[PDB]
Design an enzyme around this catalytic site. Structure first.
Site, mmCIF file in Angstrom:
data_model
loop_
_atom_site.group_PDB
_atom_site.id
_atom_site.type_symbol
_atom_site.label_atom_id
_atom_site.label_comp_id
_atom_site.label_asym_id
_atom_site.label_seq_id
_atom_site.Cartn_x
_atom_site.Cartn_y
_atom_site.Cartn_z
ATOM 1 N N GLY A 198 0.781 -1.194 0.000
ATOM 2 C CA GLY A 198 0.000 0.000 0.000
ATOM 3 C C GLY A 198 0.838 1.282 0.000
ATOM 4 N N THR A 199 0.230 2.290 0.560
ATOM 5 C CA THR A 199 0.680 3.662 0.784
ATOM 6 C C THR A 199 1.441 3.690 2.159
ATOM 7 O OG1 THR A 199 -1.375 4.367 1.874
ATOM 8 C CG2 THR A 199 -1.288 4.529 -0.519
ATOM 9 N N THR A 200 2.104 4.819 2.482
ATOM 10 C CA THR A 200 2.659 5.100 3.805
ATOM 11 C C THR A 200 1.539 5.723 4.639
ATOM 12 O OG1 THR A 200 4.916 5.394 2.954
ATOM 13 C CG2 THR A 200 4.424 6.330 5.108
ATOM 14 N N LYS A 226 -8.070 8.566 4.675
ATOM 15 C CA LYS A 226 -8.011 7.134 5.013
ATOM 16 C C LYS A 226 -7.970 7.040 6.461
ATOM 17 C CE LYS A 226 -4.368 6.381 2.365
ATOM 18 N NZ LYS A 226 -3.286 5.671 1.629
#
Lengths: 122, 175, 163, 145, 85, 243, 41, 250, 245
Positions: free
Chosen positions: I30-32, I62
């Site tokens: 995913g993302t950080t 998020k």
């Protein structure tokens, strides 16, 4: 009298923090020269010898600091002879910093053995 | 060897185990002889070759001043009568003259398999090789100033013969 | 009878005795075979430490009469180590007889030096002194100097117990 | 370096490009040719490759397949697959032998990464593990031009 | 190898190497139950060899014990079987 | 059916693959434990390490206090350890209402074992990997140590160890107890009991450990407490006060 | 096949006791040996 | 979500066998030598005590469990299977008989109740079948002293002596020969130590035998020292010292 | 080996089921997102990826709230993270009714823990493939926790997960050391923003939009609130000052 002894004792508790037992501060003969020479002054050399020997069984600013001091006091014991001559035996069996088992290397290590062994033969 | 043993320190654990099996009997047979238990036989390094196993093998050779004998196991696989017997024999004879020596066997599966599937294609050449190593060991000739060190990534294509004590007894693992 | 009534602990006892009988009658061959059967029987069952060592005492005794002082040495060695760990809880006759024999086997084998080592050792000789122990020392020594006078002297003083 | 990841994008074409740019001699060495059923000869071939490569330096040794300097498994069929363990091992032993000097390059290529002996953990071996992704709108458009 | 049989193998290898009144067989009889004659001989021989590399000339019952315990395992497996503990 | 390790059913050999693998690699998580019995205490020492400076090591727990008096030492991983903790806690509490009495080590051990066994026969659950050592100083038995292990097998101890320095710990205590003719040492104060533990620990695992590398849980009559970080150093320095 | 084994086991007994024939005795003991094997735990 | 497993995990093979029962039996053969004897003046059951550790209690350990007051059971097989099974056997025995007919189930009736547990478990999926075999040795005052075997599938058969575990057949030979009915309980204890010494070698003691008898009464086993109203237990497990005393008695 | 790549109802010899390994992997994919504990609070920040101008700001944040004082942010796959939270919420509503008190951050760790662990005892339920970083202020102090997908979780002083996990721990570990724990909650927004900047350097194929929220007992009063307006705007500037590029 007391004050100079205290500065050795309180400065010992500073030195115990000082010593190197992990990656903390630093391992110095400078502090130990203040304790051992000025305690020799407050008291005498024989008295210094017994108290010091018990202190060495715990820290010591890495043991070479202690090994150097042990040789000076030893020369005084020998010089006087009699029971202090006996005291040399006692001290060397109690702690291993001039018959050192943390490292096998040193000239001071050997010298201190040669003098004890020579008196025993004689 | 072409790389130092003290300079590769930080690989410390492996270094010390290797000193104590190799160096002490080679310099001083006399201590092993007095007790009346033989000097060590064969050593295995197992676990990654790519972590610097190879470096260690060269490095031990450097301090003893031992003759380092690097062997390609496949090259011990000539397809002629007895050339393959001849090489094992030469390698051992020369080790005795040029003793102390490290005999280093690079990936042992080809001179010390287990069989492909119990079947054979070329896995009898492997058996011909392997009986010769077991024979020198079992023999009247004894390993103590010639040391053999086996290397392989995995111990799961070493023969059961080797895994049995008395053809390897020392097993160093890379931690 | 024994081997089809399950009187199997008794079987070891009789086999050892059957041997002693054979040995005296002059059937040195018969004794070894019988003993090998006592050995098969002993390992069939659980039994005391002492029993096992006692057959081995007979094994070493046949191995002086049928030669191979080396093989006699090795059992008597086994009996003696075990009695060392028993310490002073070994019975008197057992400990004394192995030790009398051990010293003797070496003298015949020409390992003269090793009788003197038993003598100095006291975990492998115990506290025991008797005429026997003194005779073995005297013969092994009489042996080293190449001295016949010394041999005759031990033979005679030590005789009743020794011979 | 070791490359895995899909060609059909000009993986082969990129390899030759690097070859042109650095002024390396491009050597296509086919891994099935070594893998000989005959003794050792294959081992010698690996050494000769290095020997010429070192004389011709700069050089990229471009290895068609990875299935015959590899695929040795971890089972007791790694016995059969000896010839392939030996060609590989030597080529690596030889590179780390000379790691400080950059004369020869080794590149292996496949559609996808196969079972192999550890070698991705070391500078002097095939350190680098390079992935091919797929194109994107800017990339397709250049490829079309 | 039955109990009288193992006992002999400890003794025979034990003759060949350093020994003293400590080299207690009683301990050993509990420690080893029925392993082949190959296996008992292998282990007893290795332990004298291993002690000496740990820079001990002497062999004791203590010495055999410390060598053995190292070789036998390096991972922890709880009792014996799943059949009885 | 299926297969003998894709779902939990007997092996060809009558073994269970899942319980034996549950014994092995659940103690190699950088954990080693011992438990020894006091005179009027029970001591546990267990390793407990934090690999970041950014992981608060207080929340890091592997000695749990099940009730105010009950402790449970888990060898094995935190996903498993909390399935067993939830069960333990619930069992403890339920027991307290229903039977009117505090939960003994032994009863908890026995109950959890039988439950694990049922989950072992199930073809849609696993046996938990964890090894659970339940400690207190019962007023119905004195200091107690009872350990369950993962197969549905469980048994009582007087002193136990887990991790592959089992042999070392055992031998030092065995020789000691054969000489003194007791399996419990006699000393009142908890402090001297922890010093006895350390002595056998240091020798046996051959190392000493930091405050934050240890976790020490002490059982007393009607209390279980964990020693603070300074409190665990105090003890390590106190033996060295003697030296 | 067992009747052939009985004779060969009987023979080792004869051979040990340094006879130049086998006896009936050897054969009974030999039958006892085979029966022992069949009964296996 | 959740289980859906209802397909039987015990199924027939081409020969007419049941894979799971075959497997389970291998475990039982490898399990601890246990026997049972009816002395006719009692019933004596002995089983191997074992220790995990010398620093481990074996008081907790369960090798002999009382299923109902006059009845004991012992086994060879898989320990965890045994422990749960004992529990379901104890429960039904107490609820369904001990104030319904006003007493314990008869031995044969209790063997059938165990048999059923094991058979439910063999028929039905979600769970594999029990891997165990029991020797249920008993007394009931309407059948005398009895010995049964309970198999892994739940097949049972009557016996008057047997042994299961490792080294069974020869253990039965020594027992067959020494006892042929009308024998003191004490004497059957003596015979039982002898059969097991020949069966187990390496180290043997009465501290590695756990022995129970059903074949005695004390006032303490009526559970009161007053005026009788009923007979009460006849199960009595011996302590290690008493067993060493019978080992000393030739 | 095998059976452990399709199931969780049986135990690996490695002590670690191959299916569990695959669950962790999707988290790093995913993302950080990160989390910072401070001397009064917690501040949460996330990198929100900008791909196209067809997406709308602050509706695809998020960060999702649970209760009143717990802010929950994650790395991995979106559907797994929302379902996990919706379950947190339901337990949270239940909690509040029954015990008449808000749900703890330690309690919530347990609630999540037991839903994940349940799906790792069963082959018939598939577990979650997100790591969720959460925390807040409660009656018993300030807490930062991180939940990993095994059903392993602990309280941390600082946390990161995702693509940018490494770069984030580096930049965080320097700032936390310098401070006692992370100084003030105000300061922590500026610090956070620097961490996101360093973490962006592993993306560089998308632009980002910075989103921070906080829960603070000295500058929010125990509620979870977004950090927007002036405070966010000074934070973008601080990052771009010290971190150049």
């Amino acid at each position: 009298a007391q004050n100079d002894c205290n500065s050795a004792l309180d400065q010992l508790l500073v030195l115990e923090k000082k010593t190197r037992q992990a990656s903390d501060l630093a391992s110095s003969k400078e502090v130990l020269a203040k304790i051992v020479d000025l305690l020799a002054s407050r008291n005498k050399w024989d008295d210094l010898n017994e108290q010091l020997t018990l202190l060495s069984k715990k820290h010591g600013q890495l043991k070479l600091s202690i090994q150097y001091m042990i040789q000076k006091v030893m020369e005084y014991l020998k010089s006087s002879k009699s029971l202090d001559l006996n005291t040399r035996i006692s001290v060397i069996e109690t702690i291993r910093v001039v018959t050192e088992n943390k490292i096998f290397v040193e000239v001071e290590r050997a010298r201190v053995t040669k003098d004890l062994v020579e008196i025993k033969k004689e | 060897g072409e790389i130092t043993f003290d300079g590769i320190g930080g690989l410390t654990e492996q270094i010390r185990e290797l000193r104590e099996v190799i160096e002490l009997p080679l310099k001083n047979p006399e201590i092993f002889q007095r007790v009346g238990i033989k000097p060590p036989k064969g050593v295995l390094l197992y676990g990654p070759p790519g972590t610097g196993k190879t470096l260690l093998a060269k490095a031990v050779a450097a301090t003893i001043g031992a003759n380092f004998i690097f062997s390609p196991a496949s090259g011990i696989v000539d397809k002629y009568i007895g050339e393959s017997a001849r090489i094992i024999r030469e390698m051992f004879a020369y080790a005795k003259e040029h003793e102390p020596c490290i005999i280093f066997m690079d990936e042992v599966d080809a001179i010390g398999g287990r069989r492909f599937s119990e079947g054979t294609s070329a896995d009898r050449e492997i058996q011909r090789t392997l009986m010769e190593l077991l024979t020198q060991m079992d023999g009247f000739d004894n390993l103590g100033q010639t040391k053999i060190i086996m290397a392989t990534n995995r111990p799961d294509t070493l023969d059961p013969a080797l895994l049995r004590p008395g053809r390897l007894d020392r097993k160093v693992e890379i931690p | 009878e024994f081997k089809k009534l399950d009187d199997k602990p008794s079987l070891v006892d009789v086999h050892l005795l059957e041997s002693k009988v054979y040995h005296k009658l002059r059937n040195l061959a018969k004794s070894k075979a019988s003993l090998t059967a006592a050995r098969t029987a002993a390992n069939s069952i659980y039994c005391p430490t002492q029993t096992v060592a006692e057959l081995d005492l007979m094994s070493g005794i046949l191995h002086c009469e049928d030669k191979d002082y080396k093989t006699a040495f090795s059992y008597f060695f086994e009996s003696f180590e075990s009695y060392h760990n028993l310490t002073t809880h070994n019975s008197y006759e057992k400990a004394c007889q192995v030790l009398k024999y051990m010293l003797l086997s070496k003298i015949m084998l020409n390992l003269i030096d090793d009788v003197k080592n038993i003598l100095n050792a006291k975990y492998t000789k115990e506290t025991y002194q008797s005429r026997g122990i003194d005779a073995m020392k005297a013969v092994a020594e009489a042996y080293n100097n190449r001295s016949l006078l010394d041999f005759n002297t031990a033979l005679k003083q030590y005789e009743k117990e020794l011979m | 370096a070791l490359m895995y990841g899909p060609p059909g994008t000009g993986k082969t074409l990129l390899a030759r490009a690097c070859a042109a740019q650095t002024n390396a001699t491009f050597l296509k060495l086919a891994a099935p040719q070594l893998v000989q059923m005959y003794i050792g000869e294959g081992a010698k071939l690996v050494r000769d490759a290095f020997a010429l490569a070192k004389e011709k330096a700069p050089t990229i040794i471009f290895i068609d397949e990875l299935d015959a300097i590899g695929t040795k498994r971890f089972d007791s069929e790694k016995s059969g697959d000896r010839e392939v363990q030996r060609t590989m091992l030597e080529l690596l032993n030889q590179l780390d032998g000379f790691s400080s000097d950059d004369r020869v390059k080794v590149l292996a290529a496949t559609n996808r990464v196969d079972v192999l002996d550890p070698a991705l953990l070391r500078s002097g071996r095939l350190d680098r593990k390079i992935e091919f992704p797929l194109p994107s709108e800017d990339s397709r458009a250049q490829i079309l031009q | 190898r039955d109990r009288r049989e193992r006992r002999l193998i400890f003794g025979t290898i034990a003759s060949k190497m350093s020994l003293a009144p400590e080299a207690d067989l009683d301990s050993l009889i509990i420690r080893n139950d029925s392993l082949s004659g190959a296996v008992i001989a292998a282990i007893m021989q290795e332990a004298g060899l291993r002690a000496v590399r740990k820079n001990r000339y002497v062999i004791l019952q203590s010495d055999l014990e410390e060598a053995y315990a190292t070789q036998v395992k390096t991972d922890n497996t709880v009792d014996k079987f799943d059949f009885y503990k | 059916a299926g297969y003998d390790r894709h779902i939990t059913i007997f092996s060809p050999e009558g073994r269970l693959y899942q319980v034996e693998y549950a014994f092995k690699a659940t103690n190699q998580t950088n954990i080693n434990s011992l438990a020894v019995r006091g005179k009027d205490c029970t001591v546990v020492i267990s390793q407990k390490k934090v690999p970041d400076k950014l992981l608060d090591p207080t929340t890091v727990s592997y000695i749990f206090c099940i009730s105010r008096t009950i402790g449970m030492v888990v060898n094995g991983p935190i996903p498993d350890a909390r399935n067993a903790a939830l069960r333990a806690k619930a069992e403890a509490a339920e027991f307290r209402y229903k039977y009117g009495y505090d939960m003994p080590c032994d009863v908890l051990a026995k109950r959890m074992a039988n439950l694990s066994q049922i989950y072992t026969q199930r073809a849609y659950m696993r046996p938990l990997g964890v090894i659970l050592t339940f400690v207190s100083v019962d007023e119905e038995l004195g200091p107690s140590i009872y350990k369950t292990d993962p197969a549905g097998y469980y048994v009582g101890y007087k002193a136990t160890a887990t991790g592959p320095k089992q042999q070392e710990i055992t031998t030092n205590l065995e020789n000691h107890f054969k000489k003194s003719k007791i399996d419990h040492i006699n000393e009142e104060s908890w402090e001297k009991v922890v010093e006895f533990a350390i002595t056998h620990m240091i020798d046996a695992l051959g190392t000493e450990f930091s405050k934050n590398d240890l976790e020490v849980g002490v059982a007393t009559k009607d209390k279980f407490f964990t020693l603070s970080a300074e409190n665990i150093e105090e003890r390590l320095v106190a033996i060295a006060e003697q030296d | 096949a067992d009747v052939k084994g009985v004779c060969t086991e009987a023979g080792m007994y004869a051979l040990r006791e340094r006879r130049i024939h086998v006896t009936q005795e050897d054969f009974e003991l030999a039958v006892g040996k085979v029966m022992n094997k069949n009964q296996e735990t | 979500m959740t289980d859906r497993y209802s397909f039987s995990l015990t199924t027939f093979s081409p020969s007419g066998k049941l894979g799971q029962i075959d497997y389970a039996l291998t475990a039982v053969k490898q399990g601890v030598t246990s026997l049972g004897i009816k002395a006719t003046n009692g019933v004596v059951i002995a089983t191997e005590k074992k220790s995990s550790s010398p620093l481990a209690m074996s008081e907790t350990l369960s090798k002999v469990s009382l299923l109902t007051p006059d009845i004991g059971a012992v086994y060879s097989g898989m320990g965890p299977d045994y422990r749960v099974l004992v529990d379901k056997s104890r429960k039904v025995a107490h609820t369904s008989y001990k104030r319904i007919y006003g007493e314990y189930p008869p031995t044969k009736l209790l063997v059938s109740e165990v048999a059923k547990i094991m058979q439910e478990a063999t028929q039905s999926g979600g769970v594999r079948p029990f891997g165990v075999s029991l020797l249920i040795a008993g007394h009931d005052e309407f059948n005398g002293f009895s010995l049964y075997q309970v198999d892994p599938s739940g097949s049972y058969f009557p016996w008057k002596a047997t042994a299961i575990g490792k080294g069974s057949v020869a253990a039965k030979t020594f027992l067959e020969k020494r006892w042929n009915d009308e024998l003191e309980l004490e004497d059957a204890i003596h015979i039982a130590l002898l059969t097991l010494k020949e069966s187990v070698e390496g180290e043997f003691n009465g501290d590695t035998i756990e022995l129970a008898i059903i074949g005695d009464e004390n006032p303490d086993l009526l559970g009161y020292t007053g005026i009788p109203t009923d007979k009460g237990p006849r199960f009595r497990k011996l302590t290690s010292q008493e067993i060493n005393d019978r080992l000393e008695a030739l | 080996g095998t059976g452990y790549d399709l199931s969780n109802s049986v135990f690996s010899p490695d002590g670690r089921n191959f299916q569990v390994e695959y669950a962790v992997k999707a988290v790093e994919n995913g993302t950080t997102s990160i989390g910072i504990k401070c001397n009064d609070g917690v501040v949460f920040a996330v990198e929100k990826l900008i791909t196209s101008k067809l997406l709308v700001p602050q509706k695809n944040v998020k960060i999702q709230v649970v209760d009143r004082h717990i802010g929950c942010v994650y790395s991995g796959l979106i559907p797994d993270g929302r379902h996990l939270v919706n379950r947190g919420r339901e337990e949270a509503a239940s909690f509040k009714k029954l015990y008449k008190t808000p749900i703890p951050i330690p309690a919530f760790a347990d609630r999540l823990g037991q839903y994940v662990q349940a799906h790792t005892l069963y082959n018939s339920v598939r577990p979650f493939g997100v790591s969720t970083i959460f925390g807040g202020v409660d009656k018993n102090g300030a807490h930062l926790y991180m939940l990993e997908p095994s059903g392993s979780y602990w309280g941390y002083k600082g946390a990161a997960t995702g693509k940018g996990r490494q770069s984030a721990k580096a930049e965080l570990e320097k700032l936390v050391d310098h401070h006692p724990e992370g100084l003030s909650a105000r300061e922590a927004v500026k610090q956070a923003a620097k961490i996101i900047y360093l973490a962006h350097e592993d993306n560089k194929e998308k632009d980002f939009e910075l989103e921070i929220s906080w829960c603070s007992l000295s500058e929010t009063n125990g509620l979870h609130k977004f950090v927007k307006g002036d405070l966010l705007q000074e934070a973008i500037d601080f990052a771009q000052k010290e971190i150049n590029g």
